[PDB]
Amino acid sequence: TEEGKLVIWINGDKGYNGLAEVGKKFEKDTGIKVTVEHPDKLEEKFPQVAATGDGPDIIFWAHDRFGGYAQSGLLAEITPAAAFQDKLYPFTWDAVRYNGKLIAYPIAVEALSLIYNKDLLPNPPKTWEEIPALDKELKAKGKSALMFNLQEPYFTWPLIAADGGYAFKYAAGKYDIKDVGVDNAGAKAGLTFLVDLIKNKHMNADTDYSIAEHAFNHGETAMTINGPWAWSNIDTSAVNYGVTVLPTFKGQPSKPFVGVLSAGINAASPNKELAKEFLENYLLTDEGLEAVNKDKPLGAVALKSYEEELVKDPRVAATMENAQKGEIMPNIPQMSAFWYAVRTAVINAASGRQTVDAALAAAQTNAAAPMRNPTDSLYCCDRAEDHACQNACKRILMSKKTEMEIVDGLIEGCKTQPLPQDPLWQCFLES
Ligand SMILES: OC[C@H]1O[C@H](O[C@H]2[C@H](O)[C@@H](O)[C@@H](O)O[C@@H]2CO)[C@H](O)[C@@H](O)[C@@H]1O
Numbered sequence: 001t002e003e004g005k006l007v008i009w010i011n012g013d014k015g016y017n018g019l020a021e022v023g024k025k026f027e028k029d030t031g032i033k034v035t036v037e038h039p040d041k042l043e044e045k046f047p048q049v050a051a052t053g054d055g056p057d058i059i060f061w062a063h064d065r066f067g068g069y070a071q072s073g074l075l076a077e078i079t080p081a082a083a084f085q086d087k088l089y090p091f092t093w094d095a096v097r098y099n100g101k102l103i104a105y106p107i108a109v110e111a112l113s114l115i116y117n118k119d120l121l122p123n124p125p126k127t128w129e130e131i132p133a134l135d136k137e138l139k140a141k142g143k144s145a146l147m148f149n150l151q152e153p154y155f156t157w158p159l160i161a162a163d164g165g166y167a168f169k170y171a172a173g174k175y176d177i178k179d180v181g182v183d184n185a186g187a188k189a190g191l192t193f194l195v196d197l198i199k200n201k202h203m204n205a206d207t208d209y210s211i212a213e214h215a216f217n218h219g220e221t222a223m224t225i226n227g228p229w230a231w232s233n234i235d236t237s238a239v240n241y242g243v244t245v246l247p248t249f250k251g252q253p254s255k256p257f258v259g260v261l262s263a264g265i266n267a268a269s270p271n272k273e274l275a276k277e278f279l280e281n282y283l284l285t286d287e288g289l290e291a292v293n294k295d296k297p298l299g300a301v302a303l304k305s306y307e308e309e310l311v312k313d314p315r316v317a318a319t320m321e322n323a324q325k326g327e328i329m330p331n332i333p334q335m336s337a338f339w340y341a342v343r344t345a346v347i348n349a350a351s352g353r354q355t356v357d358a359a360l361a362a363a364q365t366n367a368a369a370p371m372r373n374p375t376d377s378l379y380c381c382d383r384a385e386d387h388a389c390q391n392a393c394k395r396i397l398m399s400k401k402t403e404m405e406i407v408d409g410l411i412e413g414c415k416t417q418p419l420p421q422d423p424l425w426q427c428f429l430e431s
C-alpha cells in the first residue's frame with residue numbers, strides 16, 4: 001500500500017468497472033486515486049498477501065469469510081457513526097459484527113434464485129422432483145432443463161439444506177464448531193438427488209459457472225441457479241427470462257446460504273481514514289451503489305434509500321423471497337474449512353469417485369477439525385506500552401509458530417519491564 005492512494009480488491013463477477021467509476025468520482029472530489037483490481041482466488045490471496053504487507057487497502061467478499069480475516073488480525077475495526085449506521089438495515093450490520101466489533105461495511109444481500117427461460121418454460125417447476133420429467137420433455141426438443149455450477153458448494157447448498165443439512169449448530173447466539181450437520185439425513189437426501197440427476201443424465205458432473213452461464217444465455221437450457229451479479233450478462237443476451245423462488249425438495253423450501261457483500265479495511269493499510277471516506281460517503285450512497293449495480297446487479301442493497309426503490313424490480317423481490325427462506329451465512333474462522341470440505345464432497349459424489357455417504361462422512365470430520373490458532377490473543381498486543389512491541393507481537397502471533405516460539409518471540413521483542421507487571425504479558429498469561 002501507499003499513503004494517499006486506495007487499492008481495492010473485488011471478485012470478477014461483481015461490478016468492478018462500476019466500482020472504478022465511483023473511484024474516479026472520489027479522485028475528482030478529493031484528489032485521492034482509487035485502483036480497482038479483481039485478482040483470481042482473491043478470498044485465498046488476501047490472507048496470503050496480508051502476511052507479506054502486500055494487500056489492498058479495501059477487500060470485498062461475502063461476509064462469511066470476514067470473521068476468519070478478523071480473527072487473524074487482517075482487518076481494522078470500522079467506526080461508522082450512529083447517524084451512518086441508521087442508513088443501512090440493522091441485519092446487514094449484524095452480518096459484519098465479530099466478537100462485538102464491526103469489522104466491515106455491509107454492501108448488499110445476496111441469495112440464489114431459480115432463473116428460467118420464459119419461452120422454453122413458461123411455468124417453472126415448484127419442486128425439484130418434477131425436474132427429471134421436465135428434462136425428458138425438453139431433451140425431445142434438443143434442450144435441457146437445468147444447468148448450474150456443480151464445482152462451487154454455494155450453488156448446491158440450497159438443496160442440501162432443504163431437508164435438514166446445516167453447517168454449524170446454532171444454540172442461543174452461538175455456533176457449536178464440534179456439531180457439523182453435513183452428514184445428517186437431510187444432507188444426504190439432497191446430495192443423493194443431485195447425484196441421481198447426474199446418473200439419469202439430467203445433468204453432467206463437470207458443469208461449472210462458465211458452462212452453465214453459456215447454456216442459459218444462448219437458450220440451450222431452460223433453467224440455471226445463480227445470483228444477482230449474473231443478470232447483467234442475461235440482459236445483454238436475447239433470452240426472455242424470469243427470477244423466482246427455488247424449487248422445494250421433499251416439500252420443504254430450498255434454503256440458500258445468504259451472503260452479504262462486505263467491504264473490509266486492511267489492518268495494515270495506512271489509508272484507513274481515506275478508506276472510510278470512500279466507503280461511507282461515496283460507495284454507500286445512492287449514486288455509488290447505482291454505479292456498481294448498473295455494471296453487475298448487487299441484489300438487495302444495504303442502503304435503505306436505494307433498496308426501497310430497487311426492491312420494485314421483481315428479480316430483487318425474488319432474491320429477498322429466497323433469502324428469507326434460507327439463512328444468513330455464519331462469519332465464524334471455521335467457515336473456510338466448512339466450505340472446502342463440502343466442495344470436495346459434492347465434486348467427489350457428483351463424479352462417482354465417492355458415494356454420497358462416504359463423501360459427506362469425510363466432510364463432517366474435516367469441517368469439524370479443530371485448528372491450532374494463537375491469533376485468539378491478538379488483543380493483548382494492543383496493551384503494549386511501545387509501538388515497536390505492538391507490531392512485533394502482531395507478527396509473532398500471526399506467524400504459524402508454536403506456543404514456545406510465541407513466548408520466546410515476545411520475550412525477544414516485547415520485554416520492557418518484568419513480565420508480571422506488564423499489561424501485555426498479564427493479558428497473554430490469562431488468555
Ligand atoms: O462456493 C462456496 C463459496 O460460497 C460463497 O461464494 C459465493 C459468493 O458468496 C458469491 O458472491 C459469488 O461470488 O459466488 C460465490 C460462489 O462461488 C461464499 O461466500 C464463499 O466463501 C464460499 O467459498
Ligand SMILES: [Cl-]
Pocket residue numbers: 038039040
Ligand atoms: Cl490475477
Ligand SMILES: [Zn+2]
Pocket residue numbers: 214
Ligand atoms: Zn459466450
Ligand SMILES: [Zn+2]
Pocket residue numbers: 214215218220
Ligand atoms: Zn452453445
